[PDB]
């Protein structure tokens, strides 16, 4: 593809990818596209990135959070339960291995699996605790799509956290089976369970 040799030799795989197409850890960003209407403009494939780390100021405005690339936003939600606050390099390792496991099981480009897991796990209807006379009757409401992406990322990663806790599976594998089983949503995953519980409670209280 015409590699260039310069005095500090950059390896041919680094030039191979990174000069022409600005693909991921190594996975493409032309294809995958979102398979749901809106949840476009709130899942931010293309802009592509090279690593899922960025010191990005997405917090100081009301909707700049949607410009975070969806892999980095899922990466950011991994570093919690207290002891793991901070530690984003661990989180990039977990995402990197999760994407590679997802390429092994169901060959199928892993950013498609991740984006389809976001579209298939965000609750389309939820519930709010209105007063209604003290013993607060709960009323059903619709949801905004940024809230759907928010809740989908929290449901996925909290399912992986609860699943990887105290068993021989690492967290890249529980993220892998959670993202796979939520992708073509199999309702054995934690996230599809929680999503349909939220929708059946809001269906009961509409």
């Amino acid at each position: 593809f015409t590699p260039v040799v310069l005095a500090t030799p950059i390896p041919e795989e680094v030039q191979q990818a990174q000069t022409e197409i600005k693909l991921f850890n190594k996975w493409s960003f032309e294809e995958v596209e979102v398979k749901d209407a809106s949840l476009v403009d709130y899942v931010q494939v293309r802009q592509p990135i090279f690593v899922a780390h960025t010191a990005g100021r997405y917090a100081n405005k009301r909707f700049r959070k949607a410009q975070c690339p969806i892999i980095e936003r899922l990466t950011n939600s991994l570093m919690m339960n207290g002891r793991n606050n901070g530690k984003k390099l661990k989180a990039v390792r977990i995402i990197k291995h999760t994407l590679d496991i997802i390429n092994v099981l169901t060959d199928q480009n892993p950013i498609q699996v991740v984006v389809d897991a976001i579209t298939n796990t965000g609750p389309r209807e939820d519930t709010t605790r209105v007063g209604g006379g003290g013993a607060a009757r709960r009323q059903a409401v619709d949801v905004s799509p940024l809230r759907r992406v928010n809740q989908a990322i929290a449901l996925l990663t909290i399912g992986a956290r609860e699943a990887a806790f105290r068993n021989i599976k690492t967290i890249a594998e529980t993220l892998a089976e959670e993202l796979i089983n939520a992708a073509k949503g199999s309702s054995t995953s934690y996230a599809i369970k929680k999503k349909d519980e939220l929708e059946r409670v809001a269906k009961s209280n509409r």
Binding site: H97, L105, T170
Partner: protein, 70 residues
């Protein structure tokens, strides 16, 4: 201690016969088949890449990833 550790004779044939057909294979999967502790799963993961059976796609310790050979 829950029938998961040592080296036993039938498990060598069970590793050489059933680690093929495994799409994704790692430490945790060689544990998770009601079988080996993680220590001999790591030993057998290095041994099944020594010849034949598995391709490593991803290297780094605390997450082994291996795939079926072709």
């Amino acid at each position: 201690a829950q029938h998961a550790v040592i080296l036993d004779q039938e498990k060598y044939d069970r590793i050489l016969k059933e680690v093929p057909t495994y799409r994704y294979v790692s430490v945790s999967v060689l544990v998770d088949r009601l079988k080996i502790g993680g220590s001999l799963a790591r030993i057998a993961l290095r041994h099944l890449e020594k010849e034949g059976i598995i391709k490593p796609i991803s290297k780094h310790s605390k997450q082994a990833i291996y795939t079926r050979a072709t």
